[PDB]
Assembly symmetry: D2
Homo-oligomer: 268 residues x 4
């Protein structure tokens, strides 16, 4: 019997096999969870990617900017998991900011239309997914979202950092709503992970100076972390998400759990 | 000679004589500052209100959602203060959230179109005003915005709290940009102030339960504050803003100064 | 197989069956851990109390102010667990402040001799236990201490709050040292728990006003917590400690995990 | 008329002309304050040093570990400032940690006798000076202490960081007591300043690796600070202390004001 034996968990945010959500899904299945996946836009690709997970998982389309996708989401989940069953967990692993809001593009030059799209996808959608799915979640259930510590400004991340600050605030209000259902809501603040997008940025996709600054940020992270930090290994992040989905942190909600090697607790 | 003798300071956000910005402007003029005011929408009213300030102050129209107002703002300020002169200070005292995002209206029921408007006005505009005016600000100058501590969720304030979380993040990035000009950027986190809007909310304009919850929040504030808190007296807040506009906190930037009676430092 | 199957864990701090450490020990044994217990002063009582745990556990004497107890502690643990074996976990559940430092006795009237004793037992000993036991802890092991959120002042807790602030700082340095051994160090910040000492304080053992203030603090905690807070039930706290002792938060160190119902994330 | 015109302010902590307190005293006198100084141990030296201040200031002996010095302090101040007069301000600029608690000496190897002495001088004395002097402080007065941000661990500073964490907690309780007198209590968190002691440490007085680590910490501070940081110039710190001693932050108490160039608001 695994950490999540028999639990029904919805996992958003898989796009490649380097997505943090891919490893969340893998570890959850290793620990006995039965998954429902949601994917955005490139559903043929996502299906082929998730064929590599240890167990079969039904895939549902979900664009979090599409009010109609959200209005049907709960019914579509029930079609998959069966009438009379509910979800035990919800993983939000969704983030986006248009290029104008990141990289070497000046902070002041991001038009609000772009910033607003990034905040819609990266922060507001944490509330609207909770709105859609709380009516079909069991008492004792768990909502978990992915965070990148925005308490201090940093180069290049720019308006994505602002979106994460908003997300942390949203999580504290979602916890108030979720508590009425006996459900917890928490974020995992991860250290940097070399996803396909992050590797491309370090390669210069958003400008050379931005790539240079993000590379220096990654190096200092492993240096500061008392137990080190391996940006090529998302398994410690996936395990921490699974910890929050289990019943082993039953009095934690509205909160942020750091899976970052301890880097944020050290100055140098 | 006053605390701000001869300094040229732009003050946004006056709408009535109970606006926090009205008292910021009054105290700044008492301390020798020469003001330029900006007003939104109801310019005849704002002119009549600000006739009551101790000294004459030119009034310029500024809707922070209007890109054309922002694109001409610096030139219009220069017309007023004179070619060859620059601003020494910028006060952002602007906030708005549509009713769906506050009060008894459920947190989950605020459509993103409404939330996005509130974040545009209450958070993004801190960056876009800095973008407009930094080119005409003197070294040693000071940008100050108004904050309401969003580190914990609270009843009724709902998505306005999320907007303040975003604003605090924006301020840390504005400080990075402003530092290139020798300019500081900081927020003042004020305790609750009985503006006309807040009195109406306590009177029930956003629902009875929301009025009840905000009234209880005000009462606990004075109880927790080691030096007390008078929501009917914005002068301590105005004085703190003037402190940040002066040269007496010359090594503080990207930061938040609490003018709240000490309430946030006490649990009970 | 339990969450802690086969792990060897040292648990300090049991004095009665309402001690938080008693429930940590019970849950750890329920999850397959093999325990070594340490007790202070009243070893006959502690032996009789811990006879009620689900499994036998050897008991060692440890006064954390006694340098000789600490200098022999590792050897005495090895005698119990066997040459060639090491500990996988260390639970610090130790706190004390003389009466002058708590309650209605004025904050200014606690002599430093008393405060220093309380800081020795409640904060410094977290470092000196780590110094004693890290040489016999396995890579991947876990040190966990008990915290009560001291980020804001509160009535009655007085100098115990100061000792907890010191403890949080000590934990960040212990994490630096422990990382060299592949060991994590973290605190669990618990909500209030009705131990025998806390029930006596609420009954007035430290003065009537202090009992009144602590009772009001307990009530507001359950009110603020989005999932509620039951001060008569330490099991959620024990489970959270066991979570940190397991391998399921492998990238968290130098950190504080809140097992408080979410109360610290809400203002009202 | 200066910022502190006519105010009577007690200033502790001068030992050389590079002491932060020397520059606090200089700026306060430049702004019209009438000072009383306190000095520890080397009173002939301190007298000769403070002969260089712009105005004469009476010097009183105060060892904060000496209960008799503290028990007579208020009477000795009244002898100097005149019967019927009170203090308007109190500056605590006192810190000490024995060598075992800093530098390359291992964190675990500092005996508690040494740590306790450092916490007595650096943290507890903030409370005991407030206890001594609040009875002779005017309503509207101000107590200010010097802080070095201890929210994250760092190399070399070791147990001094723990003492600063305790000091921040003490300040929140002193604010509760001081509020009964209408007095504010706050800390200024300064960036690193090249005092004589700090120059010697960088020169290796506490070991080569500790000097190397502190030098790297200083360099990163100026790099992170959006307005830069000059460790050879304590005037911005002195000005910030004077700001808190004035009436221009009248609603701030129990709090920490950062005079650090904004460095703590930036990660890289
Ligand atoms: N270093 C890092 O990679 C890092 C660090 C900390 C936190 N995080 C966060 O982890 C989460 C997962 O990101 P990742 O790094 O695994 O990258 P990723 O690119 O693999 O995943 C981002 C996902 O967001 C999805 N998404 C984008 N727009 C969407 C929309 N309109 N509707 C639905 N889904 C949408 C994409 O389809 C993709 O699956 C994000 O919140 C990210 O901010 C990442
Ligand atoms: N208790 C409180 O009142 C409280 C507490 C802390 C902080 N604050 C903040 O102080 C600031 C001032 O608010 P207030 O309480 O004085 O209320 P207010 O209603 O008097 O001022 C709000 C101002 O925002 C302006 N504004 C709205 N939309 C605008 C737009 N599109 N363009 C330009 N200006 C626009 C309004 O015209 C008005 O002048 C706000 O940021 C508010 O969040 C208020
Ligand atoms: N509400 C609460 O009870 C609460 C809340 C949060 C955290 N905590 C913390 O949890 C921990 C356990 O306390 P508890 O509430 O279970 O109370 P408790 O009285 O049951 O346990 C305190 C323990 O400290 C031990 N101790 C005292 N002096 C010692 C010494 N010199 N050497 C060794 N051990 C010594 C006592 O023997 C006792 O076992 C403490 O750190 C406490 O501060 C308690
Ligand atoms: N980089 C820095 O120098 C730095 C940074 C931030 C904060 N601070 C703090 O500023 C304060 C002033 O330190 P400084 O850097 O100016 O160094 P300093 O050596 O010039 O001043 C320290 C003072 O503490 C006094 N002191 C020590 N033991 C005492 C006792 N028993 N009784 C009374 N006074 C005693 C000394 O006599 C001396 O005047 C300290 O709290 C220090 O921690 C310093
Ligand atoms: K490291
Ligand atoms: K009060
Ligand atoms: K509740
Ligand atoms: K810099």
């Amino acid at each position: 019997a695994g950490l999540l034996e028999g639990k029904r968990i919805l996992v958003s945010g898989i796009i490649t096999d380097s997505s943090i959500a891919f490893h969340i899904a893998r570890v959850a299945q290793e620990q006995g969870a039965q998954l429902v996946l949601t994917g955005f836009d490139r559903l043929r690709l996502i299906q082929r990617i998730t064929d590599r997970l240890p167990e079969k998982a039904p895939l549902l389309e979900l664009d979090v900017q599409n009010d109609e996708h959200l209005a049907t989401l709960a019914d579509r989940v029930v079609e998959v998991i069966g009438e009379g069953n509910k979800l035990d967990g919800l993983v939000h692993s969704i983030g986006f900011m248009p290029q104008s809001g990141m990289g070497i593009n000046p902070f002041f030059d991001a038009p609000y239309e772009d910033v607003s799209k990034g905040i819609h996808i990266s922060a507001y959608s944490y509330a609207s997914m909770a709105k859609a799915l709380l009516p079909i979640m069991n008492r004792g259930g768990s909502i978990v979202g992915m965070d990148f510590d925005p308490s201090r400004a940093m180069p290049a991340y720019n308006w994505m950092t602002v979106a994460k600050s908003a997300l942390e605030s949203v999580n504290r209000f979602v916890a108030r709503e979720a508590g009425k259902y006996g459900v917890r809501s928490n974020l995992v603040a991860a250290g940097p992970i070399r996803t396909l997008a992050m590797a491309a940025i370090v390669g210069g996709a958003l400008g050379e100076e931005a790539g240079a600054q993000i590379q220096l940020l990654e190096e200092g992270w492993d240096q500061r972390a008392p137990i080190g930090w391996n940006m090529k290994d998302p398994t410690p992040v996936a395990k921490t998400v699974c910890a929050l989905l289990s019943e082993w942190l039953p009095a934690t909600t509205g909160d942020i759990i750091f899976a970052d090697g301890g880097a944020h607790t050290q100055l140098l």
